[PDB]
Design a protein around this ligand. Structure first.
Ligand SMILES: Cc1cc2nc3c(=O)[nH]c(=O)nc-3n(C[C@H](O)[C@H](O)[C@H](O)COP(=O)(O)OP(=O)(O)OC[C@H]3O[C@@H](n4cnc5c(N)ncnc54)[C@H](O)[C@@H]3O)c2cc1C
Ligand SMILES: CCCCCCCC[C@H]1O[C@H]1C/C=C/C=C\[C@H](O)CC(=O)NC1=C[C@](C)(CC)OC1=O
Ligand SMILES: Cc1cc2nc3c(=O)[nH]c(=O)nc-3n(C[C@H](O)[C@H](O)[C@H](O)COP(=O)(O)O)c2cc1C
Ligand code: FES
Ligand code: FES
Ligand SMILES: [Ca+2]
Lengths: 198, 408, 206, 251, 412, 446
């Protein structure tokens, strides 16, 4: 239990997918207007990551790993296509569930569900799992922790942007520039965990 | 070599398996059924529709005169209906045309409401009463340097159901027309040397649609009369094409085919005792004529009316005979006009400058209670600005100012 | 003739990163060295242009159900070939780029353009649009990389221009220019300048 | 569209893409391997003091002047195997090819040591002039790897090179500074008692000393890492027995 | 007459005047010397006497004992280290080579081992004052530039930012580094957001973080905390992290660092942080006046005590930071300074009474956590405060959502 | 009992002596058009017209059927209009004693009258404007009802009159008005008061609730928050004790009762006391020879929430029961912001004044400082007793985010509820204006 707790804590804080690895920045910057919208997007990302990482682990270990399928034959060059296809299929099925017969929560999220496929955070998490050679349980835990960390970062940014309703940003910086500066400051704050080796 | 074969087969199988999984999941997670679009409606009025797409597409396919104006453009905002069951959630882009006080009653824009499940429609005030007619030109007579009046003949002894100030829709096919085809008299045609409009021509390769207001009044039975302005290129870059259907309508003459549809209007007059003030310029005389004739002759009530008009020069004013006859038999009405640029042949002796300044300085400056009157307005853009500004500086509230612009 | 207009508009008028928010992760990552930034720009130009070309070439027959699957197939194939070529001929830069070569697949510019333009246009126009978007992306990346590399190591393309105190010179490098937070500030100030010279891009006040 | 046409289109596209992808991925494998090997060969040639530039010159001089060998740490004598392709960094983490270190044994904080390691002899005809030892240990931010070239007396250092580190460029990154790496030449690894004697001394070494080298200025959590690296890799768990064998006779 | 002069020169800055573009500075001087003389015009025809000028001058006066003791202690530590290292002609040659030392000697002081508090504080002055002047001038340039270009009223708050930034840096900071740090803190962290009352980060710590991560070699290590040429000595937190309480020794004098020494401030470090007693004396006044948040201070203390006691309980046989008690965490590093003067910035804290407790608890927990389990940095007060600045809005949001649910239940 | 713990009793000088005396003779009265929220007048009189008491003067366009009537018999002399011809005041010159009369009933018949008859009589007499609706503080529509009518029998405003002294003279009228309100309400009538005794109505649905503590313990907003929280679908009506006396007199004698008992007090008033006056009296004539020499400000109402009575507005407000006069603070001090103020008031403890407990201040109209942004020192939480987030709500109002202000609790407030927050603001903001702006938007959009 202690090992998995350490892994989850590391994934959430010491290797924050958004503010330590800087992946997913397009949607992280664009959809940070409202706290609840960011919350829904973060929960969707959590589901996608936690379902994608273990399946990719299984596929890689059973087929793509060198000598896994046939001795002397390695198909490691199919890693990118396999990962992207699995992620796309999972996201398509989840959207088919959401914008349809189970829970009409699709609406508010709108056009970002299709963009969850090209969210660099999920692909980077799968790549990091492949590099680190995790087990299946370690996979599940790492995916869940990475999703939780990304959701936390996005929610914090949304809260800050909601607080900025009182601000007086110059006209040129109003919009994207001030958000970029705010994200940089948030990363500066998150640099407190750099030296920790959990 | 073996690695190549293994990679090919593995690529193919992985992609095929993912595609098969997606298709199988679709068969369960999408209904793939059929639903009926319910209407305020009688039980057979419903429309059968497989789910998918916007709601307005099924109403248009069923031949219903669903509300729409300005050819759509995603900005007209006239595509609103009321839905009682199944309306779903409002799309944020609707808020620019629907207020918070109106959205809570279930009013939705037909463009945005997707037909994804069964719904019930309370179509407003029986839109089914709208019709379209095939029609013949009675006359197309010029009246000003850029204004012409079109007279129209309803078939089978019918008369369009309308109230004063309403408008009808007009459509034109793919057509080519040139300014040399026009039949404008020289008295009006001499002023076109400003841009040498005789050089100009226009053409379109697919049908278009616009709307026009009606210069007649409800008890002017059997005909629809319109006032049309020849849309000319703007002066800053006058090399651009002229008005596509303005030119087409300008070229028609007596006996030619025409079609009309969509009798509509939100410019109806309020039913009160208080005084009425009509103000307009240029081509805006048609709704004013409609309102004044309708009130004087149909309603017959003894209210107080006034009409103010602005124009460029004296050769731009018409309907003087009609307004003078109305005034000669009704003391409740009076008409005044002013000229921005009275020309040497005008021999003008009346008020000059823009009509808002004339109105304020001569009538409203001394008015006992200007906020109690009703102001109907339609005219050039700077009339559209200045009249509203001057009225609002006198304390006149919005609910007493009614504006009918020419579609922005 | 709209060739030049299409190639040049994304540079300033419709920039991939500074108007649309598309292509930001790689901009934050690979812009600590001009060689990596330049190679990344070339790779993105290549991939976007060819993916647009092919997707537009098969736009009429693509099944609607699995269009994203086939589009990802095209892009992933192109990126895999690019990765093989890089590891074969530019091993050093490839070892430096690391995961971000594979992440070209999830670079939002490629799919944004493939969906918005390639599905609706002809092959040659799609190719030209991909070239233009890649040029704008490269403009942003090289502008950031210049400042970051110069002020963080005293170098340009590995060429010493500011002698370092550690090497016996006078310049002391700025350590923050080698960390991710610097890219955010640089991009923000660049957006500020772009919108100062192009006021029509200013966002309306909420 | 029909499911028949959907599957046909997907299958055809998959075949077309996979053909070229697999062909490219299989045609360049040998060149990728060559690049990977030459990167390592260049570093070894550099630490050996042999100038070389270009793939041709590197791959010629490495073959004609260097000779990889396998060494058993527990006994400090040579072992049979394909030394030129041995992957120590992988054999160290595999359960059957390595051991788990104990807390009092793991001075370098590596947590595992491979059963057999690789060393590179430097040749002059058939005479051995130097032996290069790959060592590593944990710094403050990363795991630091290095090559140390030791003469044939088993005591004298001929050069040091840190070829992989992730410390701060200005503080801990000085392990790659040529001025600091030039201090290691001529230093003695062992004292009279044939015990580890390398000392990273804080504040600078007393000039003329045969064991002390200057610590990294403002960087002690990294100098400690270097000290632990050498303390572990000159001990019984490292190249201790092998170096004693070299000293009393070998190569 | 200053009063008549200020009101007979105003026409040069009125619209259409010879100096219409300098009205900001004119009004700043005029309303500094005299009160505006304005009146209420809409409602609440009576107003409280408090204003931002007093709110800021009180905080500026609160750090005066800390400033003076830091000056004295910097001078004393430098003199002790110099006399420990050198002697006689070598010491004379060292003194003649540094302008701090030979200026101290010229102005009447002595650098010998028997120097008094006057010479010690003079030597500390020759270090503190240039940094403060550079910080103030450089930051005020940006403040005035932004406020003039945007046509705002130049306001206070930089008055406190400059001094707090100048008191939290080692006595040996290069002046150009100080200028860069204050530029970053004022511009990037505050002014781009609209100025005073409209940022979300702490402007003082934002610049210090810039220096910390951009030039770590001048704000860390052994060579920066005692302004003695050639002296290299560790400080309390580093010595504890190395060898527990048995490693707390003052090399310059060979004496043991005791809790009483740490509490008074007889230790090296940043200029103004050292004196916990002086910081407590200063903070008591502004907490009594209602300017600082006792809720935030109590939350910080609660978090510190809880986490430090948990570490003491679970223990560790290798990490010596696991046995440092709460009363030792209190007196070392910049914990007291940060808690009293930098964790209480009203604009960067939570705007809810319930959120302030959580904000302080998070700050304390993060400070102790960085100190103990992060090997790279011996202290983490500024990093903890910057980290909690990100999550204060979330605490406010949670409290507000609970309040809104209560409202919908028709009980609020 | 409800005990308010957070608030502020302002220690301004010159408190009235709670004894009623006759005031200066009044020759002019007026109705002020801008003190009625959302009113758009339709004038029924023009200069030179002669009016009877309770005769209509104008109607509200936006509130159909509501009639505003003359407080006295006389002649219209002025109809003042400001920017955009907005009505400022209709001034009547007192002459004669003619009046419009109505029906009268016995004291024991009032509890069982018909609601429609009560509403008809009130609207016709023009006394219907005494009521106000929370939210939006507007006159109720004549076709609407409410389940909670709040009577305010306490007054905690600075220098305010003591309601008990006034009520003791009109016990029968007060009880009759309470009975009429009980008949008029669908639910309950809440009589909010202090701990002392008042005449009691015997009706089962009239309740007495005792509130304790400093200001704002005496505000109808606080009473509504603590007894009947209001929202978009739960509106409550607010009336004060003197208007209840007027209602009782109306339904007992058939005549509009326009007398008042107001508190004339302030630092510059020679003899603070209660004075008998008439509705909408001329303050300039009321304060004649009552003030010390110099430049002063006359306020219709409290110094916390009142209208500067100069020019066309120099008349007593409809909902105001006091007149406050204080000096104009236009002096400049050398380093005044840095002085150890013994004579300076503050909620914070930065000045020496708080050490002198029981001290009384000669406050003026100075703004002690310049305008700044909001630095949340925490002053609002010391003076807002309601269950709200003061800092966040005020920041929402400043930013103009009406949608979130409604959630945070804007609908429950009035301009008078934020007077203390405006008072204790170090940034010198004025929150009543912002609250009215946001409420205007909320009302307009529906
Ligand atoms: C309810 C309603 C009632 C109306 N009633 C009347 C009425 O009674 N009488 C009347 O005359 N109109 C009326 N209109 C206006 C009319 O319906 C159309 O708005 C329009 O005036 C008809 O012109 P068109 O469609 O032929 O030309 P359009 O093609 O619609 O006009 C296009 C214009 O844009 C210009 N243009 C095109 N490209 C450029 C360019 N690059 N740069 C600059 N300029 C350019 C063209 O030269 C031309 O002037 C009414 C509109 C509405 C909505
Ligand atoms: C661009 C034009 C040329 C540049 C200008 C030339 C260089 C400018 C630079 O030397 C600085 C001065 C600027 C300070 C700015 C801001 C300060 O925050 C203002 C300030 O402390 N105000 C006050 C402090 C006290 C005394 C107590 C509260 O009262 C106040 O009002
Ligand atoms: C407000 C404040 C915040 C500080 N924050 C840090 C920090 O985050 N990291 C750090 O290494 N030192 C920080 N310091 C400096 C240390 O407290 C201390 O002065 C320095 O590390 C040398 O003393 P020490 O090593 O014994 O802690 C801070 C100082 C102050 C006054
Ligand atoms: S580039 Fe857009 S999510 Fe990474
Ligand atoms: S097209 Fe008319 S509102 Fe959408
Ligand atoms: Ca090993």
């Amino acid at each position: 239990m202690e090992h998995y707790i350490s892994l989850l804590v590391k994934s959430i804080f010491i290797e924050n997918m958004a503010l330590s690895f800087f992946l997913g920045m397009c949607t992280f910057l664009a959809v940070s207007k409202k706290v609840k919208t960011s919350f829904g997007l973060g929960i969707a990302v959590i589901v996608v990551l936690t379902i994608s990482v273990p399946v990719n682990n299984l596929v890689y270990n059973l087929v793509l790993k060198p000598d896994a399928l046939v001795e002397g034959v390695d198909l490691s060059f199919l890693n990118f296509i396999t990962f992207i296809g699995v992620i796309a299929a999972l996201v398509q099925i989840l959207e088919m569930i959401l914008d349809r017969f189970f829970p009409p929560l699709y609406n508010a999220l709108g056009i970002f569900l299709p963009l969850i496929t090209v969210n660099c955070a999920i692909f980077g998490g799968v790549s990091f799992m492949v590099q680190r050679d995790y087990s299946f349980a370690e996979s599940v835990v790492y995916g869940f922790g990475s999703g939780v960390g990304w959701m936390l970062a996005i929610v914090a940014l949304a809260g800050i942007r909601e607080k900025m309703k009182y601000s007086d940003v110059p006209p040129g910086l109003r919009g994207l520039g001030i958000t970029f500066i705010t994200a940089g400051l948030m990363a500066l704050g998150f640099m407190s965990f750099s030296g920790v080796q959990l | 070599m073996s690695t190549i074969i293994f990679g090919v087969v593995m690529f193919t199988l992985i992609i095929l398996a993912l595609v098969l999984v997606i298709l199988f999941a679709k068969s369960k997670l999408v209904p793939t059924g059929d639903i009926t679009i319910s209407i305020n409606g009688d039980p057979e009025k419903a429309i059968v529709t497989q789910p998918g797409g916007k709601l307005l597409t099924a109403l248009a396919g069923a031949g219903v005169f669903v509300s729409s104006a300005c050819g759509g453009g995603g900005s007209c905002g006239q595509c609103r209906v009321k839905i009682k069951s199944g309306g779903g959630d409002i799309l944020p882009t609707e808020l620019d045309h629907i207020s918070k006080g109106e959205a809570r009653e279930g009013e939705r824009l037909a463009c945005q409401v997707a037909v994804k499940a069964d719904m019930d429609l309370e179509l407003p005030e029986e839109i089914f009463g709208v019709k379209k007619w095939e029609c013949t030109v009675i006359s197309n007579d010029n009246k000003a340097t850029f204004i012409k009046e079109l007279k129209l003949a309803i078939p089978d002894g019918e008369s369009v159901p309308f109230r004063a100030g309403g408008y009808i829709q007009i459509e034109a096919p793919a057509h080519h027309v040139k300014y040399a085809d026009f039949d404008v008299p020289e008295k009006y045609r001499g002023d076109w040397d400003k841009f040498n409009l005789f050089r100009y021509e226009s053409k379109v390769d697919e049908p278009i649609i616009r709307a026009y207001s009606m210069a007649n009044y409800p008890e002017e039975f059997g005909i629809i009369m319109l006032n049309v302005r020849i849309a000319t290129p703007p002066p800053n870059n006058p090399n651009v094409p002229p008005g596509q259907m303005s030119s087409y309508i300008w070229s028609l003459k007596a006996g030619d085919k025409c079609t009309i549809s969509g009798p509509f209007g939100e410019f109806f007059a309020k039913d009160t005792d208080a005084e009425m003030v009509f103000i307009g310029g240029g081509a805006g005389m048609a709704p004013m004529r409609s309102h004044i004739f309708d009130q004087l002759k149909r309603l017959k009530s003894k209210r107080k009316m006034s009409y103010w008009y602005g124009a460029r020069s004296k050769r731009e004013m018409f309907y003087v005979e009609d307004f003078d006859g109305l005034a000669a038999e009704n003391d409740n009405f009076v008409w005044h006009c002013a000229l921005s640029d009275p020309q040497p042949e005008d021999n003008w002796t009346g008020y000059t400058g823009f009509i808002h300044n004339v109105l304020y300085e001569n009538y409203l400056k001394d008015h006992e209670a200007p906020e109690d009157c009703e102001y109907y307005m339609c005219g050039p853009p700077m009339m559209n600005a200045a009249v509203i500004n001057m009225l609002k500086n006198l304390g006149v509230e919005e609910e007493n100012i009614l504006l009918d612009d020419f579609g922005g | 003739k709209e060739l030049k207009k299409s190639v040049l508009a994304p540079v300033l008028d419709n920039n991939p990163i500074a108007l649309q928010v598309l292509g930001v992760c790689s901009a934050l990552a690979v812009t600590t060295k001009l060689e990596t930034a330049f190679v990344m720009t070339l790779a993105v130009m290549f991939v976007t242009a060819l993916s647009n070309f092919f997707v537009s070439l098969i736009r009429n027959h693509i099944p609607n159900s699995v269009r994203i699957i086939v589009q990802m197939a095209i892009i992933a194939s192109l990126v895999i070939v690019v990765d093989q070529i890089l590891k074969a001929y530019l091993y050093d830069i490839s070892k430096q780029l690391s995961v971000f070569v594979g992440l070209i697949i999830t670079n939002c510019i490629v799919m944004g353009r493939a969906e918005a333009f390639a599905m609706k246009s002809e092959p040659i126009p799609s190719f030209i649009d991909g070239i233009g978007n890649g040029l704008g992306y490269g403009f942003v990346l090289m502008t950031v990389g210049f400042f970051r590399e110069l002020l963080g190591s005293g170098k340009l393309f590995g060429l010493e221009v500011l002698p370092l105190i550690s090497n016996g010179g006078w310049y002391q490098p700025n350590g923050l220019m080698l960390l991710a937070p610097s890219a955010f500030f640089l991009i923000g100030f660049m957006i500020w300048a772009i919108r100062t010279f192009k006021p029509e891009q200013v966002e309306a006040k909420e | 569209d029909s499911i028949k046409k959907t599957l046909f289109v997907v299958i055809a596209l998959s075949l077309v893409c996979s053909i070229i992808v697999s062909a490219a991925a299989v045609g360049l494998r040998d060149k990728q391997k060559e690049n990977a090997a030459l990167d390592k060969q260049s570093k070894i040639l550099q630490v050996a003091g042999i100038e070389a530039k270009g793939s041709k010159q590197i791959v010629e001089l490495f073959n004609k002047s260097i000779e990889p060998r396998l060494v058993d740490f527990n006994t400090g004598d040579f072992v049979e195997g394909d030394a030129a392709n041995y992957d120590q960094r992988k054999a160290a983490k595999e359960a059957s090819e390595s051991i788990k270190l104990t807390a009092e044994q793991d001075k370098a904080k590596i947590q595992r040591r491979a059963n057999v390691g690789v060393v590179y002899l430097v040749k002059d005809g058939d005479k051995t002039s130097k032996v290069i030892l790959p060592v590593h240990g944990n710094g403050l931010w990363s795991m630091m790897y290095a090559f140390v070239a030791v003469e044939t007396d088993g005591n004298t250092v001929s050069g040091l090179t840190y070829y992989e580190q992730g410390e701060t460029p200005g503080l801990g990154g000085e392990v790659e500074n040529p001025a600091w790496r030039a201090q290691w030449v001529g230093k003695k690894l062992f004292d009279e008692n044939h015990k580890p004697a390398i000392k990273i001394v804080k504040g600078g070494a007393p000039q003329g000393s045969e064991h002390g080298v200057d610590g990294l200025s403002g960087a002690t959590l990294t100098s400690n890492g270097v000290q632990n690296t050498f303390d572990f890799w000159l001990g019984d768990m490292g190249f201790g027995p092998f170096l004693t064998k070299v000293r009393d006779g070998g190569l | 007459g200053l009063k008549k002069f200020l009101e007979d020169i105003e026409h040069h800055f009125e619209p259409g005047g010879k100096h219409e573009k300098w009205f900001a500075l004119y009004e700043a001087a005029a309303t500094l010397f005299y009160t505006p003389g304005l009146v209420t015009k809409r409602s609440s025809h009576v107003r409280d006497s408090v204003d931002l000028k007093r709110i800021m001058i009180m905080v500026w006066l609160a750090v005066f004992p800390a400033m003076f003791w830091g000056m004295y202690n910097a001078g004393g530590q430098a003199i002790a280290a110099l006399n420990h290292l050198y002697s006689g002609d070598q010491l004379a040659a060292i003194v003649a080579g540094n302008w701090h030392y030979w200026l101290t000697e010229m102005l009447g002081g002595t650098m010998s081992s028997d120097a008094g508090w006057g010479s010690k504080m003079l030597l500390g002055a020759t270090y503190f004052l240039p940094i403060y002047a550079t910080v103030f001038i450089v930051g005020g340039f940006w403040e005035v530039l932004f406020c003039m270009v945007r046509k705002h009223e130049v306001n206070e708050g930089f008055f406190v930012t400059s001094i707090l930034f100048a008191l939290i840096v080692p006595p040996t900071l290069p002046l150009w580094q100080a200028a860069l740090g204050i530029t970053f803190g004022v511009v990037v962290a505050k002014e781009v957001f609209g100025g005073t009352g409209r940022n979300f980060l702490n402007p003082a710590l934002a610049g210090r973080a810039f220096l910390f991560f951009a030039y770590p070699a001048q704000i860390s290590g052994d060579l920066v905390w005692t302004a003695a040429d050639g002296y290299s000595g560790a400080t309390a937190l580093s010595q504890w992290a190395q060898g527990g309480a048995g490693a707390l020794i003052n090399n310059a004098t060979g004496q043991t660092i005791t809790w009483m020494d740490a509490f008074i401030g007889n230790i090296p470090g940043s200029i103004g942080e050292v004196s916990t007693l002086a910081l407590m004396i200063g903070a008591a006044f502004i907490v009594y006046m209602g300017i600082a948040s006792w809720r935030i201070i109590g939350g910080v203390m609660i978090g510190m005590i809880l986490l430090s006691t948990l570490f003491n309980v679970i223990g560790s046989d290798t990490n010596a930071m696991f046995n440092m008690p709460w009363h030792w965490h209190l007196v070392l590093g910049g914990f007291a300074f940060g808690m009293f003067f930098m964790a209480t910035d009203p604009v960067s804290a939570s705007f809810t009474n319930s959120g302030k407790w959580a904000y302080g608890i998070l700050i304390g927990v993060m400070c102790v956590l960085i100190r103990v389990v992060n090997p790279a940095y011996p202290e983490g007060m500024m990093l903890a405060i910057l980290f909690a600045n990100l999550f204060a809005p979330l605490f406010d949001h949670v409290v507000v959502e609970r309040n809104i649910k209560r409202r919908l239940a028709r009980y609020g | 009992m409800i005990t308010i713990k957070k608030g502020l009793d302002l220690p301004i000088a010159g408190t009235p002596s709670q004894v009623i005396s006759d005031g200066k003779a009044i020759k002019k009265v007026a109705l002020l058009g801008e003190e009625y929220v959302g009113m758009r007048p339709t004038m029924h009189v023009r200069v030179g017209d002669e009016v009877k008491k309770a005769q209509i003067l104008f109607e509200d366009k936006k509130n159909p059927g509501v009639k505003f009537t003359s407080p006295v018999s006389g002649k219209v002399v002025e109809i003042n209009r400001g920017a955009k011809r907005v009505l400022q005041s209709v001034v009547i010159e007192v002459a004669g004693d003619d009046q419009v009369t109505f029906d009268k009933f016995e004291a024991n018949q009032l509890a069982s009258l018909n609601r429609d008859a009560i509403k008809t009589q009130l609207v016709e007499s023009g006394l219907w404007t005494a009521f106000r609706t929370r939210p939006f503080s507007k006159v109720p529509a004549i076709d609407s009802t409410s389940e909670a009518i709040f009577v305010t029998a306490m007054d905690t405003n600075p220098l305010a009159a003591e309601p008990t002294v006034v009520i003791n003279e009109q016990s029968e009228a007060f009880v009759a008005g309470l009975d009429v309100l009980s008949a008029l309400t669908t639910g309950k009538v809440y009589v909010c008061k202090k701990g002392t005794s008042l005449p009691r109505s015997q009706q089962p649905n009239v309740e007495e609730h005792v509130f304790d503590g400093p200001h704002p313990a005496g505000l109808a907003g606080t009473h509504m928050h603590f007894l009947y929280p209001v929202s978009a679908d739960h509106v409550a009506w607010s009336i004060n004790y003197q208007d209840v006396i007027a209602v009782g007199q109306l339904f007992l004698t058939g005549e509009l009762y326009t007398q008042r008992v107001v508190s004339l007090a302030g630092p510059v008033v020679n003899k603070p006391r209660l004075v008998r006056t008439v509705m909408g009296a001329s303050l300039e004539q009321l304060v004649d020879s009552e003030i010390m020499p110099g430049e002063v400000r006359i306020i219709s109402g409290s110094v916390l929430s009142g209208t500067k009575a100069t020019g066309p507005h120099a008349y007593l407000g409809r909902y105001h029961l006091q007149v406050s006069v204080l000096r104009e603070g236009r002096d400049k001090e050398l380093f005044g912001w840095a002085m150890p103020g013994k004579n300076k008031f503050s909620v914070t403890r930065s000045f020496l004044g708080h050490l002198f407990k029981g001290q009384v201040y000669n406050m003026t109209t100075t703004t002690n400082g310049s305008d700044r942004s909001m630095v949340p020192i925490g002053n609002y939480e010391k003076v807002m007793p309601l269950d709200m987030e003061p800092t966040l709500l005020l920041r929402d109002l400043c930013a103009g985010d009406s949608d979130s202000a409604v959630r945070l609790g804007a609908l429950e407030l009035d301009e008078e509820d934020l007077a203390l927050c405006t008072f204790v603001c170090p940034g010198k903001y004025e929150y009543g204006q912002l609250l009215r702006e946001c409420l205007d938007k909320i009302e307009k959009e529906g």
